[PDB]
Design a protein around this ligand. Structure first.
Ligand SMILES: Nc1nc2c(ncn2[C@@H]2O[C@H](COP(=O)(O)OP(=O)(O)OP(=O)(O)O)[C@@H](OP(=O)(O)OP(=O)(O)O)[C@H]2O)c(=O)[nH]1
Length: 287
């Protein structure tokens, strides 16, 4: 868990910008379940046209077809998108780094410089899998004594890649309520200010609209199509015995169950950033 406050934000921005001076290429790590909503809102200012691999992590928990639309979006921006499962295991990362830096190193070769390992770092919001990926790529878990301060080191990855063993951590998008719901549904933010009941309502409605049969079969429920959302809570709660004071619904328990099941991909593997539904937001952001 990370506590943002204005001071910490300024520090993070300054420190990451500084690490970026040290590298040839940046890996912007996003959640494949929300490849656009899991980005830091100032990421393009921080990265500042550094060659970029966008890594859509947790691909195992997302929808490939939707992911491919986001990959096209990143391609159109001049980035090199790849998807990975950092947990279950990623030789494609070194390959993407070589392509993203191809133009730079060709210009170096033309000016008569020797070849050298590519330097890279990973940047992204919290909980998207940065430390998981670094440890996997290092093939080992990355001061051990109290009060001893660890120094940032380079990790040799494959043949051509040197990877900074420390990620740059930036803050998530804060300003938009729908984005807040998306981040809570994926578990990027397990924190307050976004009411959990509204997160569960958002998640249920998403599933009703996009995977209704699977939602029903998962909880073994059948619900009238003209019922309001409360009926879904009541049905799940009834079927799972989440009741209190006789046969009233324990809504807190049902809410927590729905959220847990969506967060942990217990119902299905979804991408909650629906590209075709985000056309206006994208246009607003683009210029
Ligand atoms: N299915 C799947 N899970 C992934 C993947 N990458 C990471 N994870 C998991 O997502 C969680 C967050 O990973 P981190 O590496 O710690 O993310 P960071 O970006 O480094 O966060 P940070 O900056 O420190 O705040 C971890 O779960 P937990 O910490 O809860 O432990 P468990 O998986 O056992 O349940 C990872 O195990 C992936 O590609 N697929």
């Amino acid at each position: 868990v990370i506590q943002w406050y204005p001071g910490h934000m300024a520090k993070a921005k300054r420190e990451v910008s500084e690490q970026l001076k040290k590298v040839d290429v940046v890996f912007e790590l996003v959640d494949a379940r929300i490849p656009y909503s899991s980005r830091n809102p100032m990421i393009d200012e921080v990265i500042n046209q550094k060659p970029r691999v966008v890594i859509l992590n947790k691909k195992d928990m997302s929808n490939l077809n939707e992911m491919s639309k986001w990959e096209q979006f990143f391609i159109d921006k001049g980035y090199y998108p790849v998807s990975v499962d950092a947990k279950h295991g990623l030789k494609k990362v070194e390959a993407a780094a070589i392509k993203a830096t191809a133009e730079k190193f060709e210009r170096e070769k033309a000016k008569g410089l020797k070849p050298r390992a590519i330097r890279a770092m990973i940047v992204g919001i919290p909980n998207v899998g940065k430390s998981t990926l670094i440890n996997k790529l290092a093939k080992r878990s990355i001061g051990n004594k109290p009060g001893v301060t660890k120094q940032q080191q380079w990790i040799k990855v494959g043949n051509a890649l040197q990877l900074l063993d420390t990620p740059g951590i930036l803050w998530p998008k804060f300003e938009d309520e729908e984005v807040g719901k998306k981040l809570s549904l994926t578990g990027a933010i397990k924190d307050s200010i976004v009411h959990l009941d509204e997160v569960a309502i958002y998640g249920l409605n998403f599933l009703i609209q996009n995977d209704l049969a699977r939602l029903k079969s998962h909880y073994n429920i059948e619900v009238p199509e003209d019922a309001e959302i409360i009926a879904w809570f009541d049905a799940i709660g009834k079927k799972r015995g989440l009741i209190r004071r006789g046969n009233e619904i324990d809504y807190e328990a049902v809410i927590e169950l729905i959220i847990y099941d969506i967060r942990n991909a217990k119902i299905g593997n979804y991408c909650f950033d629906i590209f075709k539904d985000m056309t206006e937001e994208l246009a607003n952001d683009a210029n």
